[PDB]
């Protein structure tokens, strides 16, 4: 007994508009976002093993779920990197929590970037999966932006059952990502 904003919108308008654009036979062919992905590469694992915990705490406060700590399966010593050194955190988002996260991101933070002209239409890949990146976490009001001791940027990537970049960009437009309309 509840509905998020973007999901109600998705089931109302966007499916209709893509149908009226691309004319699929079955509606099962309709594109739909599955999951959302978050990652943070600490990179100074061999110099600060504590920024890892810092990033864990930030993403906790940001996404409302305890992250995963991705280990280094290979040992490349030109970076000090050794088998099992924690280099980064990672979180998966699916469902109502995902739609809420996109609502927050599109409505609070991305309208808080400094001189946001536009996210490119060219972060796609093969079929329409949008892989962008943030330099700082100085933007989410979710975050306690008084306590941060360093910039700890991140990298986001958005995956969809779309089959090509045209359908991907069209769907993400209907959903309200500020592309550079070109």
């Amino acid at each position: 007994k509840a509905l998020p904003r973007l999901k109600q919108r998705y089931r109302e308008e966007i499916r209709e508009a893509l149908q009226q654009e691309f004319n699929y036979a079955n509606v099962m062919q309709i594109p739909g976002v599955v999951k959302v992905v978050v990652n943070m590469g600490v990179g100074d694992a061999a110099r600060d093993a504590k920024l890892i915990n810092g990033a864990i705490n930030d993403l906790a406060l940001i996404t409302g779920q305890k992250p995963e700590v991705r280990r280094a399966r290979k040992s490349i010593a030109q970076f000090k990197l050794r088998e099992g050194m924690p280099i980064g955190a990672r979180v998966t988002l699916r469902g109502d929590r995902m739609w809420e996260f996109l609502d927050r991101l599109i409505s609070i933070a991305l309208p808080r970037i400094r001189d946001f002209r536009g996210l490119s239409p060219k972060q796609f890949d093969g079929t329409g999966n949008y892989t962008f990146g943030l330099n700082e976490q100085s933007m989410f009001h979710e975050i306690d932006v008084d306590s941060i001791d360093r910039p700890r940027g991140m990298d986001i990537t958005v995956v969809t059952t779309a089959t090509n970049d045209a359908e991907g960009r069209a769907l993400l437009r209907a959903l309200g990502f500020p592309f550079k309309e070109n």
Binding site: F22, T127, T163
Partner: protein
């Protein structure tokens, strides 16, 4: 001229099931006095067999499709329970008391486990 990209989870789930079922099958055996109790599940209904892997033959059978088993009202679990009853009766008619239990590539618990536990209760030795 629309065209897809790759694997659907139906294919994934199917071939993973076959993968782990024919993993498990290494240890399970078949014989006409100790046959294998295979189970084959779907979301809606369920099927089971007693198998002799010496000849790849079959001695009993049951499923939740038969109207006499649909005459249950209760949960999926209760359908499964009555199925275990029927297969106990049929197996012990055709002349099998002891068997093994192949979970067929599925996890134990829920409908599978309630079936098997009903059968253990109603006489089969496993």
């Amino acid at each position: 001229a629309h065209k897809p990209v790759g694997q659907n989870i139906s294919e994934v789930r199917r071939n993973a099931r076959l993968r782990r079922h024919a993993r498990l099958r290494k240890k399970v055996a078949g014989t006409a006095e100790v046959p294998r109790l295979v189970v084959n599940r779907s979301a809606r209904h369920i099927h089971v067999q007693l198998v002799n892997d010496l000849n790849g033959t079959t001695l009993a059978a049951a499923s939740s499709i038969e109207a006499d088993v649909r005459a249950i009202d209760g949960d999926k679990k209760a359908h499964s329970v009555r199925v275990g009853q029927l297969i106990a009766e049929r197996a012990k008619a055709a002349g099998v008391e002891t068997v093994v239990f192949d979970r067929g590539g599925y996890t134990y618990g829920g409908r599978i486990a309630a079936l098997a536990d009903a059968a253990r209760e109603a006489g089969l030795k496993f």
